[PDB]
């Protein structure tokens, strides 16, 4: 699920560690 | 106020107390030698294994080590298998291990953790409400709901509970049932109700439903701080970046990527129309809900500042040109990709996620009449062979009236101003 157009993700990025 | 304490950890009291001191004063170093000295004397002692715990956190964020980290998620693991653990002593350690097992990613080990927490605590509201965010990292809208909906029916005037079932049941396209959710919800102003994804789309719903009472939640939004204007609602921005509808190629200064594409539109024009006619798949329709009504799909070549190697296949030579503009396949921020539109299509008022992009649009092929895109406070049509630019983080609405098909070429960069260490360190979106 990404945020491509819109902002209909409750999250737009994702992280991993540091 | 909470009692981390059993009966025998009580009777250690000063040793424990000595040790934490150690790890107040920042001397973390010494810190953990003291825990880890306790553990092994106590290996039964619940407040001598959170020490550790917290010692190798600290550690962590030290020496900016996963590994460790992942140690002391371990550590906190080890807090909650011990025997009299008191109670706030377990939750807090528990919740601690969900909260850094989302920090390295492990969404589907948060949500054991939090599953667990809601097993050890089931009248604790907030527990709930932590498991349903947790569902909603991996985007379990589905098990999300359901938790909400659960914390709803015990307690009806939980705010964190509505402004969530409301994000969600919008997600759903459920919009009129919505509303009254995200609008009770940030009006209760419990903790974590102040969101702008809330504000955000509270007003897009009643944008939709004609409520003309949308503008007043952006305008409270941006009030609280959530967006840089009422205009721009973008929710992961750089502060500080030129802020305007549209711009020029000059103003840009990506004059030669313009060039580029205006020079050679024919050839992305012609591999647009083959892929249309040989291999149609390739074009998705959109799928974030923006459309009112219409068809409307787009063909990736570039998303996240990654080629795609299947789809460039498909349009090799674009891709071939693409490749000398670093300051577009590199926007792991943007896209690259086509875009047809057909007519009886209107797309919904919405906005980009981010202000850290511009966003280039090259008309390939354009009916005479019929499209048009409005950016703010002006509408615009596109030509073929043409350039148009706007920042797509300002609120921005597309029709399709024409009698044929219209396809354009959308090229994202960098927001010319993004210095390039910070071009290389924003997380994609
Ligand atoms: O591609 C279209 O027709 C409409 N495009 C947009 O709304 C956009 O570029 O973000
Ligand atoms: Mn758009």
Redesign the pocket.
């Known amino acids: 699920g990404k945020c491509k ?1 819109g902002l209909g993700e409750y999250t737009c990025t994702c992280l991993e560690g540091f | 106020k909470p009692k981390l304490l059993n009966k025998f950890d009580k009777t250690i009291k000063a040793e424990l107390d000595a040790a934490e001191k150690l790890r107040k004063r920042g001397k973390i170093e010494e810190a953990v030698n003291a825990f880890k000295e306790l553990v092994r004397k106590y290996p039964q002692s619940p407040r001598a294994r959170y020490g550790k715990a917290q010692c190798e956190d600290d550690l962590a964020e030290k020496r900016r080590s996963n590994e460790v980290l992942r140690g002391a998620i371990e550590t906190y693991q080890e807090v909650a298998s011990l025997p009299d653990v008191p109670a706030d002593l377990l939750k807090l350690s528990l919740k601690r291990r969900s909260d850094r097992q989302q920090f390295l990613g492990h969404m589907r080990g948060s949500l054991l953790t939090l599953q667990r927490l809601v097993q050890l605590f089931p009248n604790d509201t907030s527990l709930k409400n932590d498991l349903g965010v947790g569902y909603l990292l991996i985007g379990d809208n589905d098990n999300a709901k359901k938790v909400y909906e659960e914390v709803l029916s015990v307690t009806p005037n939980d705010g964190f509970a509505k402004v969530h079932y409301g994000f969600i049941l919008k997600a759903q396209n459920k919009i009129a049932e919505s509303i009254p959710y995200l609008k009770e919800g940030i009006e209760s102003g419990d903790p974590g109700t102040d969101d702008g994804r809330f504000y955000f789309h509270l007003g897009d719903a009643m944008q939709r439903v004609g409520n003309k009472e949308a503008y007043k939640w952006y305008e409270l939004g941006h009030k609280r701080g959530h967006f840089a204007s009422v205009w721009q609602r973008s929710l992961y921005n750089v502060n500080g970046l030129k802020a305007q509808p549209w711009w020029t190629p000059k103003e840009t200064g990506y004059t030669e990527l313009v060039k580029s594409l205006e020079r050679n539109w024919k050839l992305i024009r012609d591999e647009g129309l083959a892929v249309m006619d040989k291999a149609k798949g390739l074009f998705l329709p959109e799928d974030e809900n ?1 459309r009112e009504k219409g068809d ?1 799909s ?1 063909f990736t070549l570039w998303q996240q500042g990654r080629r795609n190697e299947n789809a460039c296949k498909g349009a090799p030579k674009t891709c071939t040109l693409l490749e000398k503009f670093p300051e577009t396949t590199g926007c792991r921020r943007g896209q690259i990709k086509y ?1 047809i ?1 057909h007519p009886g299509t209107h ?1 919904w008022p ?1 906005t ?1 996620p981010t202000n850290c992009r511009l ?1 280039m ?1 090259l008309g390939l092929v354009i009916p005479k009449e019929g499209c048009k ?1 409005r950016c703010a406070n002006e509408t615009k049509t596109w030509e073929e062979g043409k350039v148009l630019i ?1 920042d ?1 983080s300002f609120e ?1 609405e ?1 029709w ?1 009236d024409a009698s044929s098909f ?1 396809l ?1 070429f ?1 090229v994202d960069v960098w927001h010319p101003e993004l210095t390039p260490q910070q071009r290389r360190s924003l997380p994609a979106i």
């Open positions: 157009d | 923006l409307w787009q875009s539109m797309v919405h980009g966003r649009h895109i706007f797509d921005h597309v399709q219209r354009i959308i």
